[PDB]
Task: structure prediction
Amino acid sequence: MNIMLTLLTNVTLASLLVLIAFWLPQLNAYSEKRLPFSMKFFLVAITFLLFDLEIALLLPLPWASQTNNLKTMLTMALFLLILLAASLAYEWTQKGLEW
Amino acid sequence: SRGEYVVAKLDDLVNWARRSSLWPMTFGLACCAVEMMHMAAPRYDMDRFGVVFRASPRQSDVMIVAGTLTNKMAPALRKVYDQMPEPRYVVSMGSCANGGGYYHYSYSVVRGCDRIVPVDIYVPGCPPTAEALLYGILQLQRKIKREKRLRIWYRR
Amino acid sequence: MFMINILSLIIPILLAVAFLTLVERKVLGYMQLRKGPNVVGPYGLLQPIADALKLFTKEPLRPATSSISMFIIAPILALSLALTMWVPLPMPYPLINMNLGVLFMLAMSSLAVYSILWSGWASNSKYALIGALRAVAQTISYEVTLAIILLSVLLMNGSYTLSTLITTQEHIWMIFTSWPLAMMWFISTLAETNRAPFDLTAGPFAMFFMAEYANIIMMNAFTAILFLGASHDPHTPELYTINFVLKTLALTITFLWIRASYPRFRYDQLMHLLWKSFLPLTLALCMWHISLPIMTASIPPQS
Amino acid sequence: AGRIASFLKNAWAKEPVLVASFAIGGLAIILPSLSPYTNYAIRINRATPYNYPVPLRDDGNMPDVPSHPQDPQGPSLEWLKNL
Amino acid sequence: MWFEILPGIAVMAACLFIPGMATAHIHKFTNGGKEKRVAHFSYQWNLMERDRRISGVNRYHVTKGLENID
Amino acid sequence: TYKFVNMREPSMDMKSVTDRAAQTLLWTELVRGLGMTLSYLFREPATINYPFEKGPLSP
Amino acid sequence: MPLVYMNIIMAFAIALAGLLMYRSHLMSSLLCLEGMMLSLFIMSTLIILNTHFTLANMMPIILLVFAACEAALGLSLLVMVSNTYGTDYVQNLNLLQC
Amino acid sequence: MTMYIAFILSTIFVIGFVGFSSKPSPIYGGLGLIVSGGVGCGIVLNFGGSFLGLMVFLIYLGGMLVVFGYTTAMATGDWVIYDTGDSGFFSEEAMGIAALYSYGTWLVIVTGWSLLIGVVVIMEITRGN
Ligand SMILES: CCCCCCCCCCCCCCCCC[C@@H](O)O[C@H](CO[C@H](O)CCCCCCCCCCCCCCC)COP(=O)(O)OCC[N+](C)(C)C
Ligand SMILES: CCCCCCCCCCCCCCCCC[C@@H](O)O[C@H](CO[C@H](O)CCCCCCCCCCCCCCC)COP(=O)(O)OCC[N+](C)(C)C
Ligand SMILES: CCCCCCCC/C=C\CCCCCCCC(=O)O[C@H](COC(=O)CCCCCCC/C=C/CCCCCCCC)COP(=O)(O)OCCN
Ligand SMILES: CCCCCCCC/C=C\CCCCCCCC(=O)O[C@H](COC(=O)CCCCCCC/C=C/CCCCCCCC)COP(=O)(O)OCCN
Ligand code: SF4
Result:
């Protein structure tokens, strides 16, 4: 309720400010007179998406550190980060990060 | 009455706002651009008057034509002027822009930038000193201060 | 009195970003052996008001053929996100006390790119579309390392609550525990807001400017809270507010300093910078900060 | 031996970021298996009571189960205090 | 000189002074002179609801001491 | 008479390599540039107060 | 089964029908697939949270990640098709036929 | 009752799906999908899944639909089913999700292998030739 009211107020303030900005200079009369598709941009977007997925996997780490299974949790976290590094290394070596 | 008092004070406020922040885009055609950059230098510091350095064409109030306008260049200058939002002002700097100057009798030079766009202030000199261009900018500010739009709207 | 609190959070931020333009101009001028605006207002103070009034009275250049819907939508989203990102910040008491404040900040920052995408798309220009694509790629590339560094740092805090960051830094600052992550975070925040040396790119223009400057101030405040932990005594929070504001101001002036000091990168140069220097070190330090509390038996409390 | 040292010296030049990253990652992997404080961290995690300790029904055959928290029977946290 | 930059900065600081300070004062005004209660984990919420029920005025911040034990 | 502007050879001993790596990983020259700009901030500007002050001229 | 589950299932069905309509613009096919995934995630999260099945809270995340991977795959394929024809029109895919 | 706020959110979810399933001008379909995703995240957040809702809002919207829009721009009855008891001194969804590294080792292994294979697959497919 508080957060929804805050977001509503933010949006309303922005909308009112934009409307007055667009309509204050509209009341006064005036004169009033392709293909390329670079692939590397798509590749960097896809790499960002995959790294974002691995970040999503890494996110529960702060709570993962209180489990009484510290060896297993540490091993799995290090394995996930090692796999992230391996993905980065494979993309690096196969000329995936060039321009 | 209060009806004209309100529009007079609104005119004063709007004129102060418009002249207190003039954002120029400069056509650095020739040697007068050098004196423009010297007017932007630390000694004269155009920015201290609210006149920013090298604004974008879509957000510029005043156009400074500093150099010789050739026949090959006139359409580009006219297009850039047309792209500018209103209210818009033009300052003609130097003899070349004012009337052709040293190249007046030439086959490839426009005899004055006022054949293409209307001009508000003419700054004379070959080139005008940075102080001269600053004086022209302040004269344009005074000209803006003199103007009255809400009053014209009210009495019409 | 919640609406009063929301307004007292929103309006002062807008005033601060209005006068940050003046501060930047004066700082750059004095670092350039000149002055900034000193004619409008006693000390150039009335310059932002004149700028705003002139901008709001100038004819707006609608493309006359582009999508009007997105042309209006982009500034709304930009400014709404810029104002929304301020609510979880504890100074020292947050307006909205979220459990996962950090994740909400990250989500809003990720949302901030739709404004760039839509503005570039609705520019109806191929060159502006290319520029928008480059900007979006840079944004996403750097928020990757932002998120990774953020989780690595928060591993020492115990949760995603920003209020707990004050308790974590009661005795020492977080800058000492991890300065390399702090340097990388600072550079990533520079690249996030499109500030030099990463600045490769009427009314709506002013509103976009307000959104960017609010994002800059917010990012510097987030850095101050995350890495420079002020001391908060519960019986006088004004001391913490003073300290936090001073640190945020110092960081923003450091942003201006950096802008005035360096040339700018190329696109491929900053792409390579990130993907070949920050990401490997970020991963290595993430592994190190996962291992360290377990190795030293210093795991933060909350779970 | 000599080849490894030469390669490391050449890598520390013109590639310092990768050398630092690999060193940090290797240390992060190796050190936990050699640290003697990790068992202390596991014990600290084991000593945090999140749930209510449900009492056991006494049947006269539990000498090691305390009848009261202040009684000496049961686990002690003197080591945690000394840490 | 350089101190001519100080005024604007000062103004900016004053603006950044307003939000946080305001929040604090409001949290004092709407909570009976104390900090707003932090309620995570659903146990603190249970404590707040119990306080609201036992207050007698439907306000959690109205604390009841030993004088209410009779 | 001619001069060479960029004809230097870095020393390849361990100390110099470590110094270059420290410069890379700690951004020493960047702080040097920052410090020079900071020093430039704390000196008097060269701006005159036109139109109340005028630039020097000659007969 | 309350109305919220019905609404999410109906949203999934609408997204499936939109995917099967295939007016044009294979990008729209991918969008409909991902709307189907979003509905699946939403109602699976509702079911798991309602029943307080703690160990199952990991299932949505996993699903999300895997589905997003597929999107990347699909996106790549889309790009390839465009690189042959210049557009992602569905009717350009008629070289192979029954 | 707030006129069945959960029902209202689900209804807006349905209208968003109807709007984007018509597939008009895929940019507009992406807009409808963004609105629907925001509404669904709101549903999850209001239900009590703060972490999963924020995961929607962050991962889905900020990365995945962003990549979708980027690629596109390149081209041409409630409240009754709720529980009664409390959670304790933690949030149950956070504990269950964190159990992925202790309980769900197999899931971590298979998901990581799938993600690395997906990186390799994307690179090979995009290699061209
Ligand atoms: C057996 C024959 C193997 C050869 C066949 C190869 C086929 C593929 C190999 C992949 C299968 C891996 C099997 C591992 C199964 C995981 C479960 C088992 O290991 O026990 C776990 C033990 O965890 C171990 O630490 C797992 C470590 C192994 C993972 C690290 C590397 C995995 C890489 C394998 C392939 C991935 C891609 C290729 C990389 C080179 C559980 O830990 P624990 O805490 O007691 O119990 C939790 C339950 N509690 C909470 C009630 C207590
Ligand atoms: C709170 C609601 C906000 C809604 C919008 C309101 C906009 C903000 C209000 C604040 C306006 C600030 C005005 C301050 C201007 C004073 C500047 C003054 O010094 O100008 C001098 C006086 O000139 C004019 O007389 C000043 C006119 C300013 C406006 C007159 C009164 C307008 C008040 C009406 C406000 C009501 C607004 C209702 C609709 C929004 C001349 O200086 P100038 O020539 O430059 O420079 C010469 C340089 N020298 C001196 C170094 C050589
Ligand atoms: C075994 C531990 C695993 C965990 C740690 C890893 C954490 C993350 C680090 C890895 C991230 C990805 C790395 C990807 C590797 C790609 C390397 C590469 O291709 O770069 C080569 C060049 O780099 C190389 O030569 C390969 C790597 C060189 C060695 C790096 C360090 C190796 C180990 C050194 C430290 C060993 C341990 C420390 C010893 C000291 C005791 C503490 C080409 O560079 P370009 O910029 O494309 O071309 C130059 C012209 N533009
Ligand atoms: C014994 C156990 C210890 C545990 C491990 C600790 C190891 C720590 C030692 C190493 C860590 C240092 C890493 C810190 C970050 C390094 C990143 C880096 O070096 O990148 C640079 C590049 O970095 C930059 O250039 C960024 C500059 C951006 C311009 C702005 C200047 C910023 C400086 C102003 C001050 C910064 C303030 C930082 C802290 C702020 C905190 C709020 C490399 O790029 P290139 O030189 O071009 O070469 C790469 C190709 N071979
Ligand atoms: S106006 Fe005079 S000084 Fe300026 S470019 Fe022309 S000839 Fe040179």
In short: The radius of gyration of chain C is 20 Å.
